[PDB]
């Protein structure tokens, strides 16, 4: 005769918070519209 | 020779939603070059 018994238990708790916050302010005063605008672009000139 | 049996309960519940919304409005400057900035910053 044979009697067998068994349990498997398992958990997989996985969490992955991720965040970016980016604030860019450009202020340009004086000069020509063309340069005022391209200076007002988000990259350094 | 053999008899084999089973039964049970299956459950699935889903909620899935995706929203994408872009606005690119350019006021002032010539039609063509304002349109170019509207299309491709």
């Amino acid at each position: 005769v044979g009697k067998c018994r068994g349990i498997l238990n398992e958990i997989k708790d996985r969490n992955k918070r991720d965040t970016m916050v980016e604030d860019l302010v450009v202020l340009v005063r004086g000069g020509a519209s063309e340069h005022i605008t391209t200076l007002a672009y988000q990259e350094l000139p | 020779h053999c008899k084999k049996f089973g039964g049970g309960k299956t459950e699935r519940a889903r909620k899935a939603m995706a929203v994408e919304d872009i606005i690119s409005r350019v006021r002032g400057g010539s039609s063509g070059w304002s349109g170019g900035l509207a299309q491709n910053r």
């Binding site: 005769v1 009697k3 988000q42 | 049970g8 910053r41």
Partner: peptide, 28 residues
């Protein structure tokens, strides 16, 4: 599961849950 016939009982219980959130906002 028991044998002298050989006969078995098996039980299963599970909860598989998945959640995702993804937010992007940019204003120029």
């Amino acid at each position: 599961s028991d044998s002298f016939h050989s006969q078995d009982t098996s039980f299963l219980n599970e909860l598989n849950k998945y959640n995702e959130k993804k937010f992007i906002f940019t204003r120029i």
